[PDB]
Amino acid sequence: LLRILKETEFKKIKVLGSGAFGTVYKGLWIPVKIPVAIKELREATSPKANKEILDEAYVMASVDNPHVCRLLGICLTSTVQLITQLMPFGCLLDYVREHKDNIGSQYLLNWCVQIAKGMNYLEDRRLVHRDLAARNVLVKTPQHVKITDFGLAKLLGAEEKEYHAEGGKVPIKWMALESILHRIYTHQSDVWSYGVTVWELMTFGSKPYDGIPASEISSILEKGERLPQPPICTIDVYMIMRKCWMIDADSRPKFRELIIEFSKMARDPQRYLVIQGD
Numbered sequence: 001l002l003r004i005l006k007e008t009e010f011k012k013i014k015v016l017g018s019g020a021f022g023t024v025y026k027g028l029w030i031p032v033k034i035p036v037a038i039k040e041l042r043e044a045t046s047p048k049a050n051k052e053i054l055d056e057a058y059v060m061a062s063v064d065n066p067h068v069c070r071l072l073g074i075c076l077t078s079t080v081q082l083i084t085q086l087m088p089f090g091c092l093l094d095y096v097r098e099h100k101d102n103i104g105s106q107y108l109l110n111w112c113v114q115i116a117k118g119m120n121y122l123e124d125r126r127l128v129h130r131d132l133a134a135r136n137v138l139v140k141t142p143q144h145v146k147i148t149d150f151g152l153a154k155l156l157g158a159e160e161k162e163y164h165a166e167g168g169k170v171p172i173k174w175m176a177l178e179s180i181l182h183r184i185y186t187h188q189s190d191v192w193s194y195g196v197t198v199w200e201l202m203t204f205g206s207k208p209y210d211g212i213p214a215s216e217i218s219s220i221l222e223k224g225e226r227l228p229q230p231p232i233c234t235i236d237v238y239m240i241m242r243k244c245w246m247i248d249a250d251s252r253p254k255f256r257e258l259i260i261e262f263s264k265m266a267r268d269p270q271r272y273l274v275i276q277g278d
């Protein structure tokens with residue numbers, strides 16, 4: 001269930017990460033004391049009132065799946081603070097940068113299946129993540145990754161088109177064209193993001209459309225430009241990524257199918273990914 005917390009019930013010990021909208025802490029929770037992650041959002045960073053935030057908090061807490069992170073608790077005050085379980089190995093984007101030399105095909109494909117498996121769970125429950133990226137995927141173990149930041153894009157008022165945050169970046173390079181142009185988020189726009197995420201892993205954490213300023217993405221997308229085939233990728237893996245980047249949303253694969261397609265590949269990993277020394 002969702003626990004309602006007082007400030008006195010937890011401590012923030014170390015800064016794990018920072019963002020435009022807030023900061024992630026390594027801390028403890030004393031309901032005995034156990035270690036947690038604590039996401040604090042800077043005051044007035046959300047367009048939602050406290051009733052609406054508390055509602056979205058219960059949805060995030062109800063999330064029950066191996067590959068999606070669950071909200072354990074919330075502290076509501078002038079600033080929103082969120083507690084989840086701590087992942088020993090941290091963010092998957094950083095991991096594939098630290099471990100380029102050491103990561104095999106099997107692993108890379110297993111992560112793709114799991115992200116899909118979690119994204120499919122969200123789709124079945126009629127929920128849209130709205131911010132899928134590698135930075136937003138955490139490592140429980142090398143063999144087990146989890147999707148994180150579910151519900152945050154909504155708390156930060158991404159859906160509400162009228163809103164324009166000040167100093168708030170948009171993950172434009174992770175967004176479907178219809179999300180860029182019309183701020184329309186669907187399960188199928190999530191698939192687009194899924195494709196960019198796979199690309200991030202296949203390149204071992206290189207930046208999408210590097211050198212290209214954000215304001216130009218829509219127009220280069222409309223010219224039909226896409227992220228290039230990653231050196232380690234066979235063309236069969238790349239076409240899956242490419243299919244995710246279709247102008248028509250209903251033609252993009254579904255997470256349900258992507259599990260089957262990536263599972264097939266993960267049973268013969270070497271055939272689909274060419275990595276030296278593996």
Ligand SMILES: C#Cc1cccc(Nc2ncnc3cc(OCCOC)c(OCCOC)cc23)c1
Binds near residue numbers: 038086088090091095
């Ligand atoms: C509430 C909440 C919430 C909301 C969104 C994102 C997160 N992020 C995390 N959540 C849980 N555990 C985390 C553990 C982390 O690392 C532990 C040490 O490993 C290097 C970690 O590291 C940040 C990036 O470094 C690689 C982030 C974690 C928490």
